[PDB]
């Protein structure tokens, strides 16, 4: 059974990947966001949805989890979804400005503001992607993100969270925080995933070298055939 | 039916992708090599092979096609193959030195020399990946690559070529050149693919924005579900 990583373990594994293993961020971020779009398309196939193209709002935060979201949005569009992005706080780095341009060239619209009421979100988007905070955030949720999470917590439509539900303690979870219907753990699940309450938990990010898996005792499941996700039941 | 691109068209589309669209090379190279490993695993599944782990020799050339090969090798290992790489001429750029390190950390061995006889290649490797020359090469095949192609042309085991069979005119093919059993066209097929004589032609590189597909009249086939390849019949 797969290892659930502490924040310190997650950070160690990441340090190795981008340093000794010499993977680049945009490379693993590409594979991670592809896994996210893949898990979404598996859990909520366009046929299962009442809108042809199904609508999705992807909300991207100010760090790497936000980047995973941008890559996720672009693959969802290729997979037959109709994504909209809300990306209020963007790092001033070419990685992210390039990702945004890519989404714009995919004809994915960016919102200028978040709808202020859950009912409006419910009415416009069949699914909401939470790409707000990742496993490095240790907190004080400041604004614009506190009120965004407040709206998310009132939604009727499902939320899919990338890696960790935003606003959860990376190890401890958060009983009173958002409760995503889908979680995509990237690389290996974090300890907070033991508190996951939704229907779908997928592992994604099929790039972990066997040597790293062995060193950290990750005990990854076997991804089937050529798939980049695995459904954890 | 899909458009088969001229060299000039292929180069235009590439210029757009990496310039106006602001995709990065390592990003599309990741997706391209993943599609290659995926097509290989579909056409030659490990179960269909007489060796548990199936052995594969991936021969990487001095440009981007060589890079696609390196990414291909690493995903093949994750897919359950036992790759070996021969990479005689390597650009002095971090893109490629990083890819090599990644393959080394995947425990993929690099050969110091090419076996000089087809029989030896046949005996050691169940499949040979031709990642030697891509659609930018306009020629004189110099050495070490001329004698490598001479050995390849004598093989009994199948060759899978990335994008274009190395040594073929990118538009005209080459009746007397290598005859791969699998071709993975990347982005859109090139005119040389009309001369393809093998059993398996896959399209890969599922990243083409609809606007670019429209502008160049690519008429891409519909990739099924979340797959990153499509079998062209
Ligand atoms: Cl604040
Ligand atoms: Cl020479």
Swiss-Prot record, chains A, B:
(6S)-NADPHX binds at residues 64-68, 134-140, 163. One of its GO terms (cellular component) is cilium. Keywords: Isomerase, Lipid transport, Metal-binding, Mitochondrion, NAD, NADP, Nucleotide-binding, Phosphoprotein, Potassium, Secreted, Transit peptide, Transport. It is found in: Mitochondrion; Secreted. It catalyses: (6R)-NADHX = (6S)-NADHX; (6R)-NADPHX = (6S)-NADPHX. Detected in testis and sperm (at protein level). Expressed at high levels in heart, liver, kidney, and testis. The modification N6-succinyllysine is found at residue 89. Binds 1 potassium ion per subunit. It comes from the Eukaryota. GO terms for biological process: lipid transport; membrane raft distribution; metabolite repair; negative regulation of angiogenesis; nicotinamide nucleotide metabolic process; regulation of cholesterol efflux; sprouting angiogenesis. Residues 10-220 form the YjeF N-terminal domain. Belongs to the NnrE/AIBP family. Homodimer. Interacts with APOA1 and APOA2. This is NAD(P)H-hydrate epimerase. It comes from Mus musculus (Mouse). The gene is Naxe. The chain holds residues 50 to 282 of 282 of the full protein.
